[PDB]
Curated annotation (Swiss-Prot):
Cellular compartment(s): Nucleus; Chromosome; Chromosome, Centromere
Protein modification: Phosphorylated by PLK1. The large dissociation of cohesin from chromosome arms during prophase is partly due to its phosphorylation.
Protein name: Cohesin subunit SA-1
Principal cellular location given in the protein's record: nucleus
Disulfide bond residue pairs: none
Domain of life: Eukaryota
Annotated source species: Homo sapiens (Human)
Annotated family: Belongs to the SCC3 family.
GO biological process, one term: establishment of mitotic sister chromatid cohesion
Keywords in alphabetical order: Cell cycle, Cell division, Centromere, Chromosome, Chromosome partition, Disease variant, Intellectual disability, Isopeptide bond, Mitosis, Nucleus, Phosphoprotein, Ubl conjugation
Associated disease: Intellectual developmental disorder, autosomal dominant 47: A disorder characterized by significantly below average general intellectual functioning associated with impairments in adaptive behavior and manifested during the developmental period. MRD47 patients manifest developmental delay and mild to moderate intellectual disability, usually with delayed speech.
Length: 315
């Protein structure tokens, strides 16, 4: 509308184009997912694009096979001013997309399963471009879903409090309307969180557990940085000795870049004098490695290790 109306509503190109995409999904899911599929393809630097006859009538693996061939250095490795903000933007895009899809489209059983199936397939690819792009996307995707779970978690607690104050209000009395609605709200929200947890598991078992050991250091670096983000954000699901073994196993990684990340992640855990109890077995297991890394070889790795150890000392 008015210039004042658009300035007082900082909808950016991204949010604008996510809002357009959401509207295009409501008309025709197929073409919208087609456009979203082609987006991930184009972000890898792949020169081909999928048509609706392929999307409808080929099995993912086949689509990936055909896009593999059409591959002339990709947008994420590009240097120069016209790609400085690409990574940053690509990551924000995934966050905006899912933030916006989080209350309806995400729980449709078509949109997330389509994306995660693509990202999983692109993460198994011989092409570096594909492995790098999909994995980074999947790591930002997991974090987006974690933020969805945290939002349910709040709503689950308001619906929990509201049911308690209505179960108690009644007692001895026939279960009225507010009490059947709330007892329904509560199941719906938990069935939402199942579905989130599910997608998280598909992303973790399918993409993470394979990529965190990847040939390329940047891909190992992306996986570690993010498991560290999940473990801080959502302690109860991700902060456990099974998931932590991935971070420990990686402390022994060959690359400064990567060792640096494991320590940065563990740092942010140990600062919280609270999940400190839940790091007790992990610390006993890798004190020898954490501590050994204070004289690492790479100065800036060693610095971090020393900082980590001082943090472990203080608790
Ligand atoms: C039932 C069926 O045959 N379909 C087509 C293939 N599926 C592909 C959609 C996601 C995807 C992943 C990897 C490459 C391309 C596309 C969607 C449904």
């Amino acid at each position: 509308g008015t210039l004042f109306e658009v300035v007082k509503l900082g909808k950016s190109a991204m949010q604008s184009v996510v809002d357009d995409w959401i509207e295009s999904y409501k008309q025709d899911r197929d073409i919208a997912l087609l456009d979203l599929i082609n987006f991930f393809i184009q972000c890898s630097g792949c020169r081909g694009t999928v048509r609706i006859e392929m999307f409808r009538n080929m099995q993912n693996a086949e689509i990936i096979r055909k896009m593999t061939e059409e591959f002339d250095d990709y947008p994420l490795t590009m240097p120069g001013p016209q790609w400085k903000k690409f990574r940053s933007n690509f990551c924000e895009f995934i966050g905006v997309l899912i933030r916006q899809c989080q209350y309806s489209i995400i729980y449709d059983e078509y949109m997330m399963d389509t994306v995660i199936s693509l990202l999983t397939g692109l993460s198994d690819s011989q092409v570096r471009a594909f492995r790098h792009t999909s994995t980074l996307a999947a790591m930002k995707l997991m974090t987006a879903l974690v933020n969805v779970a945290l939002n349910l978690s709040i709503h689950q607690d308001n619906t929990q409090r509201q049911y308690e104050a209505e179960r108690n209000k009644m007692i001895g009395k026939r279960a009225n309307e507010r009490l059947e609605l709330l007892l329904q709200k509560r199941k719906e929200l938990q069935e939402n969180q199942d579905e989130i947890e599910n997608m998280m598991n598909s992303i973790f078992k399918g993409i993470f557990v394979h990529r965190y050991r990847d040939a390329i250091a940047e891909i190992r670096a992306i996986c570690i940085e993010e498991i560290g983000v999940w473990m801080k954000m959502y302690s109860d699901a991700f902060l456990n000795d099974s998931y932590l073994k991935y971070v420990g196993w990686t402390l022994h990684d060959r690359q400064g870049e990567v060792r640096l990340k494991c320590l940065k992640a563990l740092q942010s855990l140990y600062t919280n004098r609270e999940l400190f109890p839940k790091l007790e077995l992990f610390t006993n297991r890798f004190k020898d490695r954490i501590v050994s890394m204070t004289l690492d070889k790479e100065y800036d790795v060693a610095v971090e290790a020393i900082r980590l150890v001082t943090l472990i000392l203080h608790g």
